[PDB]
Amino acid sequence: LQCYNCPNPTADCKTAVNCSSDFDACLITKAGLQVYNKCWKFEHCNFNDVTTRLRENELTYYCCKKDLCNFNEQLEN
Numbered sequence: 001l002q003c004y005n006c007p008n009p010t011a012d013c014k015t016a017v018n019c020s021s022d023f024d025a026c027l028i029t030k031a032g033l034q035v036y037n038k039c040w041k042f043e044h045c046n047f048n049d050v051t052t053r054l055r056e057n058e059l060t061y062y063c064c065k066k067d068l069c070n071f072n073e074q075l076e077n
């Protein structure tokens, strides 16, 4: 399950990379103008398992089951 992972929440990250094991759902969150592109599990794909791990509250999140599915262009702005 490959997934994108940048060192900062920017809206122009085009670097793909394997997210090791422990990941079955790419995650593309967009809390306003910050785009969080990190790998995530499907069991934790809810409106709380992602707002608690990141320690945040206002934000979005779309899980994907395809290698490199988070490329800034799935749920729209």
Ligand SMILES: *[C@@H]1O[C@H](CO)[C@@H](O[C@@H]2O[C@H](CO)[C@@H](O)[C@H](O)[C@H]2NC(C)=O)[C@H](O)[C@H]1NC(C)=O
Pocket (backbone or CB within 6 Å): 002, 016, 017, 018
């Ligand atoms: C992530 O690791 C995989 C190893 O599985 C690299 O190779 C991919 O292997 C799968 C099948 O297991 C193929 O379907 C992919 O097309 C392969 N990817 C490539 C680029 O050949 C994969 O390349 C690795 N990704 C990165 C960014 O390193």
